[PDB]
Amino acid sequence: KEWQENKSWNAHFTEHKSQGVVVLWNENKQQGFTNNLKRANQAFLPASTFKIPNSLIALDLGVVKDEHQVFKWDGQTRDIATWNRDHNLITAMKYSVVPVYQEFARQIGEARMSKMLHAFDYGNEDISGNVDSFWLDGGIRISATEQISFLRKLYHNKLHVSERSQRIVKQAMLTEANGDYIIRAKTGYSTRIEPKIGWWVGWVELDDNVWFFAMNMDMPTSDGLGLRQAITKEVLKQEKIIP
Ligand SMILES: O=C(O)c1cc(O)cc(-c2ccc(C(=O)O)c(OCc3ccccc3)c2)c1
Numbered sequence: 001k002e003w004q005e006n007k008s009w010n011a012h013f014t015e016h017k018s019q020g021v022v023v024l025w026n027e028n029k030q031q032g033f034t035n036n037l038k039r040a041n042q043a044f045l046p047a048s049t050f051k052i053p054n055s056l057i058a059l060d061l062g063v064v065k066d067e068h069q070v071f072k073w074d075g076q077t078r079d080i081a082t083w084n085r086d087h088n089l090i091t092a093m094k095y096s097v098v099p100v101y102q103e104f105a106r107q108i109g110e111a112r113m114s115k116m117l118h119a120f121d122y123g124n125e126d127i128s129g130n131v132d133s134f135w136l137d138g139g140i141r142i143s144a145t146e147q148i149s150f151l152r153k154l155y156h157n158k159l160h161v162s163e164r165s166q167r168i169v170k171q172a173m174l175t176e177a178n179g180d181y182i183i184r185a186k187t188g189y190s191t192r193i194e195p196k197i198g199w200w201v202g203w204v205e206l207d208d209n210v211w212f213f214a215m216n217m218d219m220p221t222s223d224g225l226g227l228r229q230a231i232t233k234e235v236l237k238q239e240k241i242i243p
Pocket of ligand 1: 048080098136188189191192
């Protein structure tokens, strides 16, 4: 009994006029939980959650030297203000700076990128489409369930890249921490191909356990993007994982 459905969490989506799936994995008990077993195994475009493997690959191949190397703004003014500045790996991941990671993808190239995704067993391991946007509008797909499996390898330094690469990416994933918990996670927003979805994948570190998580929800407009974290935290409080 390693997977179990719990439809009570649907109340949180409903209260917010929303549809989606939340997947939790208790590492100690080696047990999973979700409010919709079928949606949890349906594969979607990773969108900017792909910045986790993209980062690992850029670092192992030396495209990126470390988390301090500066990537200069190219001077094109884009719609997202925080993109129009210089970034390092920490801030590029935090603000989902797509044009920085498209540069990484072009430097990596099609053959290296495909070979690395096979090694990771990442999603359907399909890179068909454009070299620098296939995670936003090409052939790659991945499920919430498949995200957790990838994230667990990363937590334990099991992926087919150096341990240094995986430690740097887990540092850059840092999102929030206090005396009660640590969250390492990555947001995503898939709008180029229907259905438009928001993502949030990562884990919650406690003193004596870690809860992995992966959620996606339908997202017609950008105004509801905060619900990704809100609905996840509401599920987390219900399960007494955070206070
Ligand atoms: O990761 C997040 O949460 C996040 C948050 C955001 O505000 C925006 C995005 C994001 C990432 C990639 C694309 C793309 O497909 O290039 C994208 O669409 C273009 C676009 C949409 C809306 C306003 C300006 C521009 C949006 C992601």
